[PDB]
Symmetry: C2
Subunit: 251 residues, 2 copies
């Protein structure tokens, strides 16, 4: 049976260190039965990194979008306007995370000390010393690019711990797309609270290409180890990003 102690240990062996700054992606199952569930993995990462470090996690809520673009699953076209009209606004304090984000994030986002950026689709949660300066501002327009959290991390010596998670979800990559010659700008929409009032606001965002994210990560590796029974790759954010920029450009 995996344990807090077990995991804390496992983590260091991988390379996590006190006072470090990491964006974490993860999967509870991939680790194999832990005595304590997600509260076991969280308390571990928290003991390794220490209050000197900074724990960061994506807490996306992409369901708060225009139903015209939904497809997993779709929804009758006759429901779009009524959906847009009655959709509850985003609120970092309670809007749940998309399912794909995983079980660790859903618990972490309401874990003591953790904070959440105010983006209605691409928010992040942080625990640590630099949680505020990394979430303070998060402009709706271009949720994850310069001025976003994944932007304020590129400027800090930061690492990306993939716990039981592949590269297909190394969100950081997204920053790079904001930095290459190719960029398809699109209007998106999300229910939001402006001046203490609900409003459906449209904004500009990039039409990402996340599929290429595995290929990019692939070529990026061309540390490692195991937390419980999960294949964990621990790299640096700044480097990880830079490569994508090059990968995309020359592609």
């Amino acid at each position: 049976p995996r344990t807090k102690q077990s995991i804390t240990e496992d983590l260091k062996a991988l390379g996590l260190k006190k006072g470090m700054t990491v964006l974490v992606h993860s999967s509870l199952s991939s680790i194999g039965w832990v005595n304590g569930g997600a509260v076991a993995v969280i308390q571990a990462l928290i003991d390794v990194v220490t209050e000197e470090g900074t724990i960061v996690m994506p807490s996306q809520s992409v369901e708060l979008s225009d139903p015209k673009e939904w497809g997993n699953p779709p929804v009758p076209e006759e429901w779009w306007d009524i959906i847009r009209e009655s959709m509850p606004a985003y609120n970092s304090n309670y809007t749940p995370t998309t399912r794909g984000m995983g079980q660790i994030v859903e618990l972490f986002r309401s874990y003591p000390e953790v904070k959440r950026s105010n983006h209605p689709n691409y928010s992040f949660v942080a625990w640590g010393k630099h949680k505020n300066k990394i979430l303070n501002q998060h402009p709706l327009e271009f949720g994850l690019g310069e001025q976003s959290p994944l932007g304020k991390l590129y400027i800090r010596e930061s690492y990306v711990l993939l716990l039981g998670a592949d590269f297909d979800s190394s969100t950081c990559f997204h920053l790079a797309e904001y930095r290459i010659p190719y960029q398809k700008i699109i209007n998106r929409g999300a229910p939001i609270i402006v001046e203490g009032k609900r409003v459906w606001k449209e904004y500009k965002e990039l039409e990402f290409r996340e599929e290429l994210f595995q290929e990019v990560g692939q070529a990026f590796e061309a540390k490692v180890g195991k937390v419980g029974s999960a294949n964990c790759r621990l790299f640096s954010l700044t480097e990880a990003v830079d490569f994508a920029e090059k990968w995309f450009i020359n592609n």
Copy 2:
């Protein structure tokens, strides 16, 4: 979910759920214990948060909404069996089990998604029991969750003790009687009593400390029968909230009947 979306005529919204709740019988200032099933409602735009707000919209800031937020997994591994765990692990398990914390210990899956989200919703409080905690929002959330002792704590002194004294209602939103936590309270007011020893991770003096306490060995398997008997002659509002079948009834009235059904069935029964 594709099934949940395809079995739904039109989207269930905060407003349409608010309407159904009022038609059903839920009113302003009412204190109500809720047992839900988010899926039984049909696709709802906003999912759980939309259902929570509809509950708040109806019951108002003068009303009080309570929900059971049990974390039964924080128990002695021996009693486990869904699935069971190798005995060779029953010791490092009691040894390394994260202690219970009202601020983060995830509710047991069977409690529902709505309750899991409701527990960390702005202004919702949670009682201090490691297995049978409750969460409440509203006018009376403080006097209901306040006390919660480890021992028994689902009987007198637990929040059920506070929902019994002051007018309270139970709301089965897509759930049946087998989920009516209020009945457990009656089990502490009857002649029959099988007393078991339980254990759980807790924090005392600011240090984790595996503690053992006494508790009744509940017979929740009967609740479905108790509720169906209660329905023979007791007032109960029935009606749909979206595509889910619901019933709203008196908690005090339900507990009392449960007691009698139990008393006369273990004494008068063959």
